[PDB]
Amino acid sequence: KNYSALFENLQNRSNPEKLQEITTKFFSDNPDVKYNDVLKYITLAMNGVSPEYTNKSREAGEKVKLHLQDILLDVEYQYQGSVMTNTHIKGYSDIDLLVISDKATNDLKNNRLLSEQKLSSVYEICDITHPKAIKITNKSMGRDVDIVIANWYDDNRQIEYRGIQIYNKRSNTIENRDFPFLSIQRINKRSSETKGRLKKMIRFLKNLKADSDEKIELSSFDINAICYNIEKNKYLHSNKYQLVPILYEQLNELVSNSNKINSLKSVDGHEYIFSNIDKKESLKMLLQEVKIIYSNLQSYL
């Protein structure tokens, strides 16, 4: 591994506009990484994307919301995506705008068609091809927003995270239950308990995925669940570099013990991550990447 080249490429991924204030704050907050490429790559791969980029990604979704508020009725607007947990690794991170009905399939079909008309009329780049989401491009800001049509799951008290059901334009039905807000709240809460350490691990693994020459087909959904499964007491006081051996132990334990990997559930606890043999092979390839980083890092621990 060429950590010098990986570090530069990582700078262009998380800071594509090359804002010098971001780079200066990085080396200022981490003076130890100087003249050592492996520490630079690890520290930046765990570092959160600067709010300079995140605020503009959230702002692009806000403009989409205002345009839809000119045509849509009986809906509420929420957001999902890595941006909402600050676990995104790209400065040009897109955002998903959820359009949830306050009240079934015909109401969702109407909101989907009305969203198509308004968004195609506002944004020159508007993709209405996929039956589960509309994708727009704010050419003025250079940001992308996906728009998803859904409603609340309604099947002696109303529980809080009853989930949403995504509208499927292709089948004219509602997709099965998803729990994006519960997942967001659980990730942010546990990261708050560990002073940001959970998000460092998540962003780290996602960057190892993007930089791997192997095809690690593990979604952010899966990477979130893997890190969220780690017990807090194992990394409560660990520094940034010590999170790498902890990720190694977790990934090695998942590949080793068959019941450990069979009991791994999603962050919301409503699905199991590993049922799918290529997914476990992707978990193995991710273990290789962590093992490589760990071996190159242990001399500094």
Task: Give the CA radius of gyration of the chain.
Answer: 21
Using a 10 angstrom Cβ sphere, with 0-12 exposed, 13-18 middle and 19 or more buried, the burial of residue 277 is: exposed
- The domain tally of the chain equals 3
Nearest-CA neighbor of 189 among 219, 161, 218? 161
If asked whether residues 125 and 242 sit together in one domain, one would say no
> In Å, what resolution does this model reach?
2.3
If asked whether residues 239 and 200 sit together in one domain, one would say yes
- Given 131, 159, 178, the domain boundary residue is 178
In the three-class reduction of DSSP (H, G, I as helix; E, B as strand; rest coil), residue 103 is classed as coil
Packed helices 197-211 and 180-193: angle between N→C axes, nearest 10 degrees: 120
Tokens of 113: 């068609």
Angle, vertex CA 196, rays to CA 191 and CA 200, nearest 5? 105
Contacts by 183-186 with C-beta closer than 8 Å and gap 24+?
183/224, 183/266, 183/267, 183/268, 184/80, 184/84, 184/85, 186/228, 186/267, 186/268
If asked whether residues 115 and 132 sit together in one domain, one would say yes
Match 């060429």 to its residue by tokens.
2
Asked if residues 180 and 190 have their Cβ atoms less than 8 Å apart, the reply is: no
Asked if residues 87 and 224 have their Cβ atoms less than 8 Å apart, the reply is: yes
Quote the DSSP letter at residue 233: G
Asked if residues 294 and 251 have their Cβ atoms less than 8 Å apart, the reply is: no
Q: How far apart are CA 115 and CA 128, in angstroms?
A: 10
Packed helices 197-211 and 277-297: angle between N→C axes, nearest 10 degrees: 110
Q: Which domain holds residue 27?
A: 1-47
